[PDB]
Amino acid sequence: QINVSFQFFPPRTSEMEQTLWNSIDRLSSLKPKFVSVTYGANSGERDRTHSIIKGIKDRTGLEAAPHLTCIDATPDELRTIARDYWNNGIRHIVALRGDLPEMYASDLVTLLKEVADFDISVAAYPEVHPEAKSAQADLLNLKRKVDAGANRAITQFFFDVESYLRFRDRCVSAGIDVEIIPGILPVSNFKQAKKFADMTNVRIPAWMAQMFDGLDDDAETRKLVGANIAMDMVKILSREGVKDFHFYTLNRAEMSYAICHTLGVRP
Amino acid sequence: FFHASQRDALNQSLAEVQGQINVSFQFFPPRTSEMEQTLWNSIDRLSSLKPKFVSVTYGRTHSIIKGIKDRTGLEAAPHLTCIDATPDELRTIARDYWNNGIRHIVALRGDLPPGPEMYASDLVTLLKEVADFDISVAAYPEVHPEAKSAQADLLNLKRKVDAGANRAITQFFFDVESYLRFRDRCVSAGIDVEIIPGILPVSNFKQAKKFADMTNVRIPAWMAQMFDGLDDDAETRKLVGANIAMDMVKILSREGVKDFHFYTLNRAEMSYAICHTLGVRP
Amino acid sequence: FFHASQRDALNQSLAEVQGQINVSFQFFPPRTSEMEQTLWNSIDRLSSLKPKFVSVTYGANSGERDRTHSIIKGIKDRTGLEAAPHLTCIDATPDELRTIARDYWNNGIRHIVALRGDLEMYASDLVTLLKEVADFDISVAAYPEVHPEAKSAQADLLNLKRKVDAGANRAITQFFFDVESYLRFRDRCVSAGIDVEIIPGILPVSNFKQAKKFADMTNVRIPAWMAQMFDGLDDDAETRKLVGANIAMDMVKILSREGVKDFHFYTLNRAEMSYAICHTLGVRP
Amino acid sequence: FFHASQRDALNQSLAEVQGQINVSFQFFPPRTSEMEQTLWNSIDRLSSLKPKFVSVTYGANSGERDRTHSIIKGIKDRTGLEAAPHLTCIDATPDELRTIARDYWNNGIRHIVALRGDLEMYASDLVTLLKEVADFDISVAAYPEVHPEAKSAQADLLNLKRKVDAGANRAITQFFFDVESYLRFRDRCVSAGIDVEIIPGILPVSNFKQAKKFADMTNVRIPAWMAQMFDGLDDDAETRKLVGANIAMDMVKILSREGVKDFHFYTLNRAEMSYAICHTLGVRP
């Protein structure tokens, strides 16, 4: 069947905290294989990420994976943190280098596997990481992370489906045998999605830009339009063999819940 | 891999139709104060899309038409049936409209009261003489329940067109292939009017399904499965329904359909969004 | 490598159709000494490709019928090719049209492109009138994207059927750049029971600014990618030529693979582009 | 309508890459006054496209090193663009090469295309020698269809790896017409652990007779459809240009869709074709 995972971020306000827990209760009913919580060095720190992870586990029993980065952290610190997480039931970590230099994501994967037999997920970039020397180098890096122990790759979001398909083919050609899980970003706020995409070199098709044109002050239409795009995307990916999806919920459940419904993932 | 590129091509072609598609909206006389307000709010919202025309069902209609015309200046076409009316009484009601600014009328026989020898074709002819109205009639891609056969039903539409109907609006449908095959059959039968698809954006499946079973409109298995389990989830139903309708008009648009009629159920949200995807914007 | 493979397959198939494609060329009466010279140069160059026929337009409401007739005569005497004059009925009475038709027939002109003409009778009326005069080969216009004055796509399609039923044995389309529109229209013609081949009219574009204006007036869609391809080339005739040839070559390659074996070229009296496109279709001297 | 849809998708994607493609142009030392003039005209025309760099060949065993150096200097002073001289080691001793390298570096030449050269040391030896002289940007040749003298495809691939490991930061391919061969080679480079981008060398063909001879000598395959496309055009330069442009435009469109964002053009000192191909890639003045 189809497996799904949901990504959340640490709330910074009382309002967002309420929204998040509402979304977790709603989405947990879909029995995701796992959920994850992002890390922001200047937007919550490791303690806030960990707190949310602990809260999810206690409230839902679901496997919750914290996103752990290695910037401004020492190897000894990372080992101590990893040991603590393991001994506390956290056995899946999304290993990342982090949004800013001594170590790269592959170094963290190796460090984590030395501590314990963690389930590890790493970032993949269908349209190439902005800092990569080349597409070839970025693919060789993903192979490096997988070879170090990563169990699966989760991709940066994309809106050009062929870009993901072509990337998946290159991964297979390179001998990367783990699942390349598409990270899906349901878009309700285009202005913000466009900003993020431009910063990560993610192409926004001309038809998509036109689809959101003139909707700056029409939230309702943006939601229906964005849901249509996301549902169409997962439909095509599903037809192309994708059996795993990771949703960038941005702490909202409505869109991701509905998209999962169309994939047959229901309570 | 082709599925991906085909979708991009479909989406891009849709983005390029911007400002070339005509749309019409259908409303019904409100039965409560809440609906009254909802209706006028929707008319204001939808009026900004500059529809070719809007229509009002008839089971107060005359009032609604005038109100819409005297408020937006849109071509408000009232619906007229052959129920509870005599061939002579349908004439006084017919010239009153022309002597009031109403030149477009949707001619139908009408739903039979729960409890005549005059059909819609007979009604169309009974209007052309009074005056040269713009007559729009109903077409049934999946065949009208009472029709003895598909061909017989098709010939009837032709009869209604030859009588003076300058356009046909279809019963709602969810099987796009059925509409396309029907559109082809119409041309083969010599019907030279466009067969405007009537689109019903579904938010309440339970109710839509009941209406469908009553009008002989088929609900595809994939659609039934798509709405299964959402009886108590209005939010998901709306996103799913919008997706279905948007996918429909997108496919229809690529097939050359440049005219759409929306059964708004007096709500603007869904139809407004579907129009947005078709490039119909304020 | 889907795209790469699809390309090699498309290219090889095109290479294999050599000696199976029929082509026709459309010219217009020269208005200057320079254009007169250009036209005859193009006629000699293109005649070497042995087209099934060539045609010469006649601007409706122009009153320059004699020019069209003169050019047609010149082509026949100079090349021995079948030359078809375009004839419009919007600017002539039935009697005048019958006289014009009879003279054509007696002058050995047995193929006429019957049109209503750019602004009482419609093209179908002209077709009927011509068949009554003599057993002419008659070609008529088809519109994949619907004629701008049609009350509906259905009405326009039934009109084509009327012209064919009246005696037209060839249908030539308005130019287009949306290949899928032509393919869908071809299927719709079958649904309407039209049994004549729908010959695509190909317009090789070198001057985009002018083609865009023409397309806008005729309801012909210019894809966004095409508008982008010509953006910034207003003063670069060389690049426009290469880009336009690429577009036309791609178009006929796809149409060829779909089974089209007849092409009508709107040459604008120039031979270079049409000659090269024909070369890719295996139509060579 | 698979082929039609695939075309529209490919074309729209190409339109959307505008402002994301990097290009470079290769020239050769003019041998006559006419060619000298042609070259500078091409350099001015192409420089307006802001290429990442341009390069100038040096025929091994020619003894005309000065010409290459002179042209490079002229380009830098006239355009301010990065100009890379090609340097071969088959006709010079290590000491001579070190002197040549030092002078380039002191003259502001920081990018060299290091080659063994057309017939003791191999290109990898030159790469190592250059890096020892200074921190040069070094580009080397790659062969998707395997260099004719290689003992095996594996040996040739490992040789590219050796050159990259020695300090080369760019790989530029021999020209090709079999797009799938390049794509497969690109994947094989990843398998070999080569992390530099493999830049496709594009040869826009106008004179097929000459390109065929060159291809035959370099082991580059000419597809049967391509040979057929140029058949019968020996004395038709106009049609050859249109056909060749069509081929190159189709090639970069497919490569672009596959993620290639860097292209190196073998201009043969002419600007027209390369300029137009760049225009389709969104590289415009």
Ligand SMILES: Cc1cc2nc3c(=O)[nH]c(=O)nc-3n(C[C@H](O)[C@H](O)[C@H](O)COP(=O)(O)OP(=O)(O)OC[C@H]3O[C@@H](n4cnc5c(N)ncnc54)[C@H](O)[C@@H]3O)c2cc1C
């Ligand atoms: C699914 C997902 C979740 C994420 N969650 C978060 C989050 O919670 N918090 C946060 O801060 N960020 C997060 N990010 C963003 C991420 O941290 C940034 O993309 C970051 O710049 C790189 O992280 P990485 O793990 O991909 O790094 P790496 O895999 O180390 O890659 C980073 C760059 O270094 C290059 N590289 C690798 N090894 C070498 C080498 N030896 N020499 C030279 N270059 C090399 C790569 O090719 C690449 O360009 C996420 C991204 C994804 C796709």
Ligand SMILES: Cc1cc2nc3c(=O)[nH]c(=O)nc-3n(C[C@H](O)[C@H](O)[C@H](O)COP(=O)(O)OP(=O)(O)OC[C@H]3O[C@@H](n4cnc5c(N)ncnc54)[C@H](O)[C@@H]3O)c2cc1C
């Ligand atoms: C766009 C649209 C708007 C509508 N608006 C309204 C509205 O405002 N009010 C309302 O009351 N209803 C409305 N309806 C519903 C409609 O009135 C019903 O569907 C009704 O059952 C048939 O109407 P008709 O106009 O199709 O009649 P007809 O076209 O006469 O068709 C009815 C049946 O008679 C058959 N038939 C025709 N002539 C003969 C003959 N001589 N002998 C035997 N069989 C024959 C036909 O095949 C068919 O089965 C609407 C429907 C549509 C699609």
Ligand SMILES: Cc1cc2nc3c(=O)[nH]c(=O)nc-3n(C[C@H](O)[C@H](O)[C@H](O)COP(=O)(O)OP(=O)(O)OC[C@H]3O[C@@H](n4cnc5c(N)ncnc54)[C@H](O)[C@@H]3O)c2cc1C
């Ligand atoms: C291959 C080709 C060659 C051409 N050559 C020339 C030329 O040399 N000179 C020139 O002047 N123009 C020329 N034209 C342009 C052409 O004359 C215009 O497109 C003109 O507007 C329509 O001519 P038609 O023959 O298609 O007319 P018709 O087939 O009569 O169609 C014109 C319109 O009338 C409608 N129609 C048909 N019958 C009726 C009816 N009974 N009642 C109401 N509407 C009806 C049709 O649907 C359509 O919208 C050419 C076009 C093509 C595609």
Ligand SMILES: Cc1cc2nc3c(=O)[nH]c(=O)nc-3n(C[C@H](O)[C@H](O)[C@H](O)COP(=O)(O)OP(=O)(O)OC[C@H]3O[C@@H](n4cnc5c(N)ncnc54)[C@H](O)[C@@H]3O)c2cc1C
């Ligand atoms: C982008 C580009 C630019 C060029 N510019 C020029 C130019 O300006 N001037 C000019 O003269 N030529 C030029 N050439 C042609 C080139 O010099 C020839 O292809 C030449 O035959 C090989 O040069 P190379 O640098 O690839 O050599 P190398 O990489 O040394 O390879 C040549 C052969 O030696 C083999 N090989 C490598 N090491 C060993 C070893 N230790 N033992 C045995 N075999 C080995 C390789 O597999 C291969 O078959 C260019 C080619 C390209 C693709």
Ligand SMILES: CN1c2c(nc(N)[nH]c2=O)NC[C@@H]1CNc1ccc(C(=O)N[C@@H](CCC(=O)O)C(=O)O)cc1
């Ligand atoms: C781990 N995230 C991430 C990444 N890639 C990089 N480089 N960095 C990241 O932090 N890829 C996946 C994910 C992307 N995160 C995000 C977060 C917010 C928005 C955004 O546009 N937020 C809007 C709308 C929120 C809403 O839905 O209401 C905002 O205004 O917050 C986009 C992507």
Ligand SMILES: CN1c2c(nc(N)[nH]c2=O)NC[C@@H]1CNc1ccc(C(=O)N[C@@H](CCC(=O)O)C(=O)O)cc1
């Ligand atoms: C003219 N209408 C009509 C017809 N066909 C027949 N036979 N009769 C008709 O009146 N075809 C088109 C249109 C269909 N009308 C309708 C009206 C309501 C609903 C419906 O499902 N109503 C629900 C939900 C309303 C809502 O969205 O709030 C209801 O419970 O009222 C469906 C079709």
Ligand SMILES: CN1c2c(nc(N)[nH]c2=O)NC[C@@H]1CNc1ccc(C(=O)N[C@@H](CCC(=O)O)C(=O)O)cc1
């Ligand atoms: C019979 N023609 C025609 C028609 N459709 C209509 N409505 N009317 C017509 O006359 N369809 C086919 C053909 C199109 N004719 C033309 C004629 C000129 C140009 C044009 O753009 N001419 C430019 C460039 C000429 C050149 O290439 O040198 C010009 O400025 O003349 C386009 C289409």
Ligand SMILES: CN1c2c(nc(N)[nH]c2=O)NC[C@@H]1CNc1ccc(C(=O)N[C@@H](CCC(=O)O)C(=O)O)cc1
């Ligand atoms: C560095 N060149 C090169 C190589 N490979 C090898 N082995 N040797 C080389 O010198 N690969 C890339 C490039 C190819 N150079 C060339 C040079 C000329 C022609 C050629 O066919 N020239 C024709 C036409 C010139 C024109 O277009 O005007 C000629 O007759 O000069 C082809 C490839």
